[PDB]
């Protein structure tokens, strides 16, 4: 059993939602949940880690993410 890491997702308005994901989780699942909770279409948003686009099938392992890393959300637009 691998552990969850907790990521902070920062919106355009500086609001924050934190997500627990495993190192092998495909990050589309985070994107979909975030968009759902914001009440906007997932394709209206782009999700960045250190300024680089997060793909649907990127994993935290591929991106080298760790506990407390930040994802920023911008309009696609």
């Amino acid at each position: 059993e691998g552990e969850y890491i907790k990521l902070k997702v920062i919106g355009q308005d500086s609001s924050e939602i934190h997500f627990k994901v495993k190192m092998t989780t495909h990050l589309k699942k985070l994107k979909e949940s975030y968009a759902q909770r914001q009440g906007v279409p997932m394709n209206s948003l782009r999700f960045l880690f250190e300024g680089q686009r997060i793909a649907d099938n990127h994993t935290p392992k591929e991106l080298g993410m760790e506990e407390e890393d930040v994802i920023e959300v911008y309009q696609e637009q």
């Binding site: 969850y4 907790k6 609001s15 924050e16 939602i17 934190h18 997500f19 627990k20 994901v21 495993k22 989780t25 699942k29 985070l30 949940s33 909770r37």
Partner: peptide
């Protein structure tokens, strides 16, 4: 705002 943490986690079928 309060802290928000979200956890990202057929033979019986009838349709």
């Amino acid at each position: 705002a309060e802290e928000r943490v979200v956890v990202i986690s057929n033979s019986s079928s009838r349709y």
